[PDB]
Amino acid sequence: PKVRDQAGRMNYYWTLLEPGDTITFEATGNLIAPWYAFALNRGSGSGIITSDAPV
């Protein structure tokens, strides 16, 4: 069925590439390549909350 006017679908994927590791992409179509990626700084006791209170 058309969703946001699209009979096509696209699956999004993620992964944590560890220091030193290499990630290789091979394709003959259908790849939505990474353009920008994110280097992560681990904290702790952060989190996600759902709120409509103002900052």
């Binding site: 702790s44 006791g45 952060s46 989190g47 996600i48 909350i49």
Partner: protein, 173 residues
């Protein structure tokens, strides 16, 4: 009053006394007044302080706990997770409330008990030299004065020093 003193044989409180939780009333010819008892009051103070702190220490403060998301094929484990959240919440709610109920009774008992101790500690000092005139009151068989009033609250009242006087007084009844 489980110890029969408070709301018991000593019917009322003394909005007059503001020195402390436990104290004496006196009326020597020189005048009237209130004087709270240091030793007992400071004890009760200390103890009840310890009691609140001890209860609160047993509560580790809560650290970051944010809920977890699940997708629609994860209903069992989303339900497992709710079961845990609800299960611990019941237990802490029950512990908190139940403790406070039970310990409130103990605290009030404590106060009742301290008061009875006080009274009886005086009573064992006076004996003959005064009579049980009701509602935690003694009546001196001898005349006594403000500085003498301080011997009572001292826990050092000299029973012999007035035993003579009180004897011939009491014996006129």
């Amino acid at each position: 009053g489980l110890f029969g003193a408070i709301a018991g044989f000593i019917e009322g409180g003394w909005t007059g006394m503001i020195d402390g939780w436990y104290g004496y009333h006196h009326q020597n010819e020189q005048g009237s007044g209130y004087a709270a008892d240091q030793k007992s009051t400071q004890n009760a103070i200390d103890g009840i302080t310890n009691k609140v702190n001890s209860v609160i220490e047993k509560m580790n403060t809560q650290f970051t706990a944010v809920g977890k998301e699940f997708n629609n094929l994860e209903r069992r484990i989303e339900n497992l997770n709710k079961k845990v959240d609800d299960g611990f919440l019941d237990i802490w709610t029950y512990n908190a409330e139940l403790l406070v109920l039970l310990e409130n009774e103990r605290t009030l008992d404590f106060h009742d008990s301290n008061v009875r101790n006080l009274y009886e500690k005086v009573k064992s000092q006076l004996k003959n030299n005064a009579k049980e005139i009701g509602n935690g009151c003694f009546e001196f068989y001898h005349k006594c004065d403000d500085a003498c009033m301080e011997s009572v609250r001292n826990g050092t009242y000299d029973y012999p020093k007035y035993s003579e006087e009180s004897k011939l007084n009491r014996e006129e009844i």
